[PDB]
Design a protein around this ligand. Structure first.
Ligand SMILES: Cc1nc(-c2ccncc2)sc1CN
Length: 280
């Protein structure tokens, strides 16, 4: 059923809340035993948001391999994403260790460091060229190379150095800076412009490791980003683009991380983004 028609049908009936709760009811439930170990309590931002054991990213160390991060693997679209929480003061070193170990080219950030007057994630990247960051727990150095500030987003070039081997890589930081404190954007134009700026970079392409995507919990805005990308890619690939069922793609993705798309407004926004995106 053409998504645009289903859309007008839910909008006129005002049943967004009812569709959203049907998804919550049918969503996968798998064990998260590693996330709930007592040694990992300070590695989790939110008590109710955990990675499933079957899909969690493992850090390459014998001490403690745990990070709040999941691999979403979309078989038919041929795309992979790592979804993670905003780093904590004690997990900034783990975060960059993961970026290094997984061979990621890009980091996508969908939140501000402070929102609603509270801290949503650590200041985990350097703000001045001449003031680099060293993560002594994971033996990494991070340097700001350049910064391009636009109206709706900022792109940064970063240099990550493995202090153990003296190898370096260029990491691109895509920072969407204008998502509102409450609700969702009124038009997805600027969100869609961001998704194609990331795409053009090569960060989402199979010659690199998976892109790392985060907001505060790594399920809401982060969910919206990977659902819209995968849905448009499937509309490109298939003989009948109307066959793309946004609700079925979301339930497939929820086999890999719990809670993706946090509100009925985020679900309506996801629909808006894929409808306007299609035209081009
Ligand atoms: C290649 C492609 N580029 C699109 C685009 C470009 C600029 N701004 C928004 C969207 S849609 C599309 C279909 N694969």
């Amino acid at each position: 059923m053409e998504m645009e028609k289903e859309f007008e049908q839910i909008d006129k009936s005002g049943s967004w809340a009812a569709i959203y709760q049907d998804i919550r009811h049918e969503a996968s439930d798998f064990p998260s035993r590693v996330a709930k170990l007592p040694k990992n309590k300070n590695r989790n931002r939110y008590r109710d948001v955990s990675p499933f054991d079957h899909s969690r990213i493992k850090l390459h160390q014998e001490d403690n391999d745990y990070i709040n991060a999941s691999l979403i693997k979309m078989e038919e679209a041929q795309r992979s994403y790592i979804l993670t929480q905003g780093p904590l003061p004690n997990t900034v070193g783990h975060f960059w260790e993961m970026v290094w170990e997984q061979k990621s080219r890009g980091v996508v950030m969908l939140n501000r460091v402070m929102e609603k007057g509270s801290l949503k994630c650590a200041q985990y990247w350097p703000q001045k060229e001449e003031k680099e960051m060293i993560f002594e727990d994971t033996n990494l150095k991070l340097t700001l190379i350049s910064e391009d500030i636009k109206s709706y987003y900022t792109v940064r070039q970063l240099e990550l150095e493995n202090l153990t081997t003296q190898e370096t890589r260029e990491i691109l930081h895509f920072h969407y800076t204008t998502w509102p404190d409450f609700g969702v954007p009124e038009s997805p134009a600027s969100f869609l412009n961001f998704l194609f700026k990331v795409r053009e970079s090569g960060s989402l392409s199979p010659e690199h490791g998976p892109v790392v995507v985060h907001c505060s919990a790594g399920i809401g805005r982060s969910g919206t980003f990977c659902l819209a990308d995968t849905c448009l890619l499937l509309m490109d690939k298939r003989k009948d683009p109307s066959s793309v069922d946004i609700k079925k793609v979301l339930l497939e993705m929820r086999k890999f991380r719990m809670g993706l798309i946090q509100t009925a407004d985020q679900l309506r926004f996801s629909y808006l983004a894929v409808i306007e995106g299609a035209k081009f």
